[PDB]
Amino acid sequence: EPYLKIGRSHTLYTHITPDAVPQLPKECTLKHLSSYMEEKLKSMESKKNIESGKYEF
């Protein structure tokens, strides 16, 4: 919704600055999506076939 409003607007392209562009939310960046894979792929292997450490209670 905010990216189509500035896209359809009659503004010159030299006036489009990074101040005038609204930021994506934190779910939508590469910083989240790359770190979310290490929440899976590192974790996915660190609980496949390995279950002696830190299952104390």
Binding site: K31, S34, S35, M37, E38
Partner: protein
């Protein structure tokens, strides 16, 4: 409060807000695994270097500099040649994971100042101070603290 003491207690008891300037800078100092001598780095597919790259032709840069009614904006000789090799190798069985897993590992390390095969500590400027982060010791709680608290504040 020393460096190994903080890694156990500050997760349980101590907040980062009550720490002195000589205590914050030493937790951002490199560990004792730094200055330990370590040969034999492990090679992997370097996503940093592009094997399909080429040189500035200077007649493309002239013709693409004069903007208007051109339909392709690169050379496509070394790229096409590369795609033909992947069609001819018949290597699939783990390369179906290599393009799809391994970048996440090296792409996230690009946000921490860490290159591809670098299993050691690499700095990262936050504000006016450097924080040495690792593959393993990410030091993420220091990064959230120094960005939020020391935005308009200075603690060396």
């Amino acid at each position: 409060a020393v460096k190994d003491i903080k890694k156990l207690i500050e997760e349980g008891i101590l907040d980062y807000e009550d720490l002195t300037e000589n205590e914050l800078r030493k937790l951002a100092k490199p560990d004792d695994n730094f200055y330990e001598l370590s040969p034999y780095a492990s090679d992997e597919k370097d996503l940093s270097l592009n094997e399909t790259s080429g040189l500035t032709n200077e007649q493309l840069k002239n013709f693409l500099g004069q903007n208007g009614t051109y339909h392709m904006s690169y050379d496509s000789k070394s790229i096409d040649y590369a795609k033909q090799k992947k069609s001819e190798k018949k290597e699939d069985q783990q390369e179906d994971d290599d393009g799809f897993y391994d970048a996440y590992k090296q792409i996230k390390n690009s946000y921490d100042g860490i290159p591809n095969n670098f299993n050691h500590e690499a700095p990262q400027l936050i504000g006016n101070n450097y924080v040495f982060t690792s593959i393993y010791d990410t030091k993420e709680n220091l990064i959230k603290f120094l960005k939020k608290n020391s935005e308009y504040d200075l603690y060396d």
